Design an enzyme around this catalytic site. Structure first.
Site, PDB file in Angstrom:
ATOM      1  N   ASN A 187      14.700  -6.762  -2.491  1.00  0.00           N
ATOM      2  CA  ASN A 187      14.925  -6.168  -1.165  1.00  0.00           C
ATOM      3  C   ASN A 187      15.612  -4.812  -1.318  1.00  0.00           C
ATOM      4  OD1 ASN A 187      15.094  -5.794   1.572  1.00  0.00           O
ATOM      5  ND2 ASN A 187      16.009  -7.806   1.995  1.00  0.00           N
TER       6      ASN A 187
ATOM      7  N   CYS B   6      12.013   1.290   4.448  1.00  0.00           N
ATOM      8  CA  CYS B   6      11.754   0.118   3.616  1.00  0.00           C
ATOM      9  C   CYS B   6      10.436   0.300   2.879  1.00  0.00           C
ATOM     10  CB  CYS B   6      11.723  -1.151   4.474  1.00  0.00           C
ATOM     11  SG  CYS B   6      10.615  -1.037   5.894  1.00  0.00           S
TER      12      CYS B   6
ATOM     13  N   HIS C 211       8.628  -5.610   7.816  1.00  0.00           N
ATOM     14  CA  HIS C 211       9.425  -5.187   6.653  1.00  0.00           C
ATOM     15  C   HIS C 211       8.604  -5.050   5.351  1.00  0.00           C
ATOM     16  CE1 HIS C 211      12.691  -4.345   4.147  1.00  0.00           C
ATOM     17  NE2 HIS C 211      13.319  -5.505   4.109  1.00  0.00           N
TER      18      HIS C 211
ATOM     19  N   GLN D 119      18.617   1.119   1.632  1.00  0.00           N
ATOM     20  CA  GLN D 119      17.947   2.087   2.505  1.00  0.00           C
ATOM     21  C   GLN D 119      18.847   2.532   3.676  1.00  0.00           C
ATOM     22  OE1 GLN D 119      14.884  -0.970   3.611  1.00  0.00           O
ATOM     23  NE2 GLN D 119      15.190  -0.185   5.688  1.00  0.00           N
TER      24      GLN D 119
HETATM   25  C1  LIG Z   1      11.626  -1.051   7.364  1.00  0.00           C
HETATM   26  O1  LIG Z   1      12.653  -0.219   7.157  1.00  0.00           O
HETATM   27  C2  LIG Z   1      12.136  -2.478   7.643  1.00  0.00           C
HETATM   28  N1  LIG Z   1      13.181  -2.651   8.691  1.00  0.00           N
HETATM   29  S1  LIG Z   1      14.730  -3.086   8.218  1.00  0.00           S
HETATM   30  O2  LIG Z   1      14.908  -2.840   6.782  1.00  0.00           O
HETATM   31  O3  LIG Z   1      15.079  -4.404   8.757  1.00  0.00           O
HETATM   32  C3  LIG Z   1      15.793  -1.896   9.056  1.00  0.00           C
HETATM   33  C4  LIG Z   1      16.889  -2.300   9.858  1.00  0.00           C
HETATM   34  C5  LIG Z   1      17.654  -1.279  10.474  1.00  0.00           C
HETATM   35  C6  LIG Z   1      17.317   0.084  10.283  1.00  0.00           C
HETATM   36  C7  LIG Z   1      16.206   0.389   9.466  1.00  0.00           C
HETATM   37  N2  LIG Z   1      15.435  -0.574   8.847  1.00  0.00           N
HETATM   38  C8  LIG Z   1      12.891  -2.563  10.147  1.00  0.00           C
HETATM   39  C9  LIG Z   1      11.873  -3.637  10.593  1.00  0.00           C
HETATM   40  C10 LIG Z   1      12.500  -1.148  10.577  1.00  0.00           C
HETATM   41  C11 LIG Z   1      11.179  -0.572  10.099  1.00  0.00           C
HETATM   42  C12 LIG Z   1      10.757  -0.516   8.593  1.00  0.00           C
HETATM   43  N3  LIG Z   1       9.403  -1.076   8.641  1.00  0.00           N
HETATM   44  C13 LIG Z   1       8.336  -0.309   8.249  1.00  0.00           C
HETATM   45  O4  LIG Z   1       8.450   0.861   7.831  1.00  0.00           O
HETATM   46  C14 LIG Z   1       6.946  -0.970   8.394  1.00  0.00           C
HETATM   47  C15 LIG Z   1       6.522  -1.572   7.040  1.00  0.00           C
HETATM   48  C16 LIG Z   1       5.132  -2.241   7.049  1.00  0.00           C
HETATM   49  C17 LIG Z   1       5.040  -3.413   8.059  1.00  0.00           C
HETATM   50  C18 LIG Z   1       4.815  -2.770   5.665  1.00  0.00           C
HETATM   51  N4  LIG Z   1       6.070   0.123   8.799  1.00  0.00           N
HETATM   52  C19 LIG Z   1       6.014   0.599  10.101  1.00  0.00           C
HETATM   53  O5  LIG Z   1       6.709   0.110  10.990  1.00  0.00           O
HETATM   54  C20 LIG Z   1       5.127   1.718  10.300  1.00  0.00           C
HETATM   55  C21 LIG Z   1       3.901   2.052   9.784  1.00  0.00           C
HETATM   56  C22 LIG Z   1       3.523   3.292  10.331  1.00  0.00           C
HETATM   57  C23 LIG Z   1       2.402   4.171  10.211  1.00  0.00           C
HETATM   58  C24 LIG Z   1       2.393   5.386  10.962  1.00  0.00           C
HETATM   59  C25 LIG Z   1       3.483   5.719  11.820  1.00  0.00           C
HETATM   60  C26 LIG Z   1       4.609   4.853  11.951  1.00  0.00           C
HETATM   61  C27 LIG Z   1       4.582   3.654  11.187  1.00  0.00           C
HETATM   62  O6  LIG Z   1       5.546   2.701  11.163  1.00  0.00           O
END
Ligand SMILES: *[C@]1(O)CN(S(=O)(=O)c2ccccn2)[C@H](C)C=C[C@@H]1NC(=O)[C@H](CC(C)C)NC(=O)c1cc2ccccc2o1
Length: 215
Positions: free
Chosen positions: A182, A25, A162, A19
């Site tokens: 992953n 993710c 995540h 990603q």
């Molecule tokens: C996801 O990409 C996981 N990562 S990561 O892979 O460690 C990473 C590291 C560096 C750059 C990018 N990604 C991070 C924790 C960042 C966020 C991502 N997480 C999500 O998308 C999360 C997944 C859920 C918990 C299953 N979703 C949100 O944060 C989320 C949900 C939303 C709904 C509406 C608006 C915004 C939202 O965000």
């Protein structure tokens, strides 16, 4: 017939993806579950477009992050999701460029796994196919994992951040686990994977927000 499954041996999971620096993710999680169901219903395994979801799932925030239910609801309402080839992954949010001609699969909705019920997740993984799951991957110990069955009591099951994929489950050295795919490239963990402790008080809250598409 040991109580264990691995959809990678069945040809239900596509190569590990990367990603990159985008909070997508959730999109790769979503695509995986959809790829599993696409194969199960047509005998064909192929890559789906996580980009298609980032640019078009308005309920989500692109590289800002998202939820898997919203993506599934999108594929349903949209009446299809493009394949990777027809909607390449760029790694940044852009205007929705969904193309009917690139349609590779759709869904009739989704089903959520009751919160914290690993047995329900196990059964969903065994009889339905790969399942989308949310965990707490903030711990540095998770980032540098390399082998064995991961488990660290600090994992906050109330701090989901995540979105990954459950490809199977089994036992290694008397330790039950979940075969987790992953999206950090095949150079991470074990060639893109990680075995996570199963039936150990829902560690990292692997069963607090799981769901799968219905095709
Ligand atoms: C996801 O990409 C996981 N990562 S990561 O892979 O460690 C990473 C590291 C560096 C750059 C990018 N990604 C991070 C924790 C960042 C966020 C991502 N997480 C999500 O998308 C999360 C997944 C859920 C918990 C299953 N979703 C949100 O944060 C989320 C949900 C939303 C709904 C509406 C608006 C915004 C939202 O965000």
């Amino acid at each position: 017939a040991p109580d264990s499954v691995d959809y990678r041996k069945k040809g239900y999971v596509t190569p590990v993806k990367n990603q990159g620096q985008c909070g997508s993710c959730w999109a790769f999680s979503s695509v995986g579950a959809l790829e599993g169901q696409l194969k199960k219903k047509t005998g064909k395994l192929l890559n789906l477009s996580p980009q298609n979801l980032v640019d078009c799932v308005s309920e989500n925030d692109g590289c800002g992050g998202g939820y898997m239910t919203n993506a599934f609801q999108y594929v349903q309402k949209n009446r299809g999701i493009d394949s990777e080839d027809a909607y390449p992954y760029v790694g940044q949010e852009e205007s929705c460029m969904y193309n009917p001609t690139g349609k590779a699969a759709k869904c009739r909705g989704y089903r959520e796994i009751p919160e914290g019920n690993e047995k329900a997740l196990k059964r969903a993984v065994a009889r339905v196919g790969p399942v989308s799951v949310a965990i707490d991957a903030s711990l540095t110990s998770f980032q540098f994992y390399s082998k064995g069955v991961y488990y660290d009591e600090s994992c906050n099951s109330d701090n989901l951040n995540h979105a990954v994929l459950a490809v199977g489950y089994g036992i290694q050295k008397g330790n039950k686990h979940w075969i987790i795919k992953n999206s950090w490239g095949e150079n991470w963990g074990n060639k893109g994977y990680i075995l996570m402790a199963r039936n150990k008080n829902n560690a990292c809250g692997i069963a607090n927000l799981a769901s799968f598409p219905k095709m």
